[model samples]
Target: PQITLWKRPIVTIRIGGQLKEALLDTGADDTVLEEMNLPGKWKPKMIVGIGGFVKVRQYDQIPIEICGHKAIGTVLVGPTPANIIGRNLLTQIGCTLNF
Candidate 1:
């Protein structure tokens, strides 16, 4: 199945048994989520975004399901403006842009 890129490619995703909405951003290199309880050891790191930089907790080997496609990867948790599903997870689900 192909994903259509509307004004914003938003989709429902599940992480750690929690369902949440996330924007599929091809421009982003990594996936970021709004602060939530995740059982894992995280390292403190800083990420620079459109609104400058913010500290984030980087968790590894997280399982996320996007539109029923499962993927395991790192997830950054922080005070993000929105939950984003970057290329890291998008690629795993075989998502691509079509004009």
Candidate 2:
């Protein structure tokens, strides 16, 4: 018997009119935009995903690029430890992970 796990490279991205690198993960289902970058009083709607309905307020779509990878998709604004590149961007580029 064997066990395995799947993981991908995480990069930092700039949000909220700031330039910074954020971790990028393909395993995730949604892009976690930086909170500090959120615009003034922007409210986000609740959506259902693997983590269930998360209350997101402050929404902003920004441009992001990954090192040595083609950049695409609109990153969503939300509260997270840091900006995360997840399914929204991955699916758009037809990317998949192998373990």
Candidate 3:
């Protein structure tokens, strides 16, 4: 599906067996989710972006369904204003900007 650049591109996705609303952020290099109790072995890491730097728990090999497209990848859990589905996941789902 095509996403417009005028507003935040938000979409529904399934993560860790739960449905979640996430922003399709092309500007982000990696996906970041709101703090959740996910079953996995996570490593602590720091991420830097426009909002500055934040420490997050990085979980690998997570299964997610974005707009019905399924993908397995790493997910970062931190204190974000909203769940973010970044380029890593967007590319897998074939999401692109229309204009």
Candidate 4:
């Protein structure tokens, strides 16, 4: 099968006061951050999936430039492989994902 790419805007976020670029994947339902990439001072907001309450953190409103458009949103600071571009940011843009 031929693979097709579904690319979204990637933004740089600060973790442990360091900056790194993360991919915005819409096909994913939950926001994820790698354990190594996760910041040290993450707190819990509410549990969304699995047994434990989700670890959430407040982020400063930083400007993200994507496709010539600018957007600002906070991301969940936790452990996972992919940094999902979920409803938190998508809903603000008034758009829906087909995936």
* TM-score per candidate, chains pooled: 0.92, 0.56, 0.90, 0.46
Which candidate tops lDDT?
Answer: 1
Clash count per candidate = 0, 12, 0, 0
Misplaced by over 4 Å in model 3 are: none
Ranked by TM-score, the better of candidates 3 and 4 is 3
TM-score of 1: 0.92
Best by TM-score: 1
Score each candidate by Cα lDDT: 0.89, 0.56, 0.87, 0.50
Q: Summing lDDT over every window of 10 consecutive residues in candidate 2, give the lowest-scoring window.
A: 1-10
> If the candidates were sorted by their lDDT against the true structure, best first, what order would they fall in?
1, 3, 2, 4
Ranking by TM-score, best first? 1, 3, 2, 4
Error of model 2, residue 74, in angstroms: 3.1
lDDT of 3 at 69: 92
Q: What does candidate 3's lDDT look like per residue over 18-42, in tens digits?
A: 8899998888999999989888799
TM-score of decoy 3: 0.90
Better of 1 and 2 by TM-score: 1
Of 1 and 3, the candidate ahead on lDDT is 1
Candidate 4 lDDT tens digits, 1-99? 111355546666454455556666555443455544332344555536545556555443434433333456555656555555555555554545444
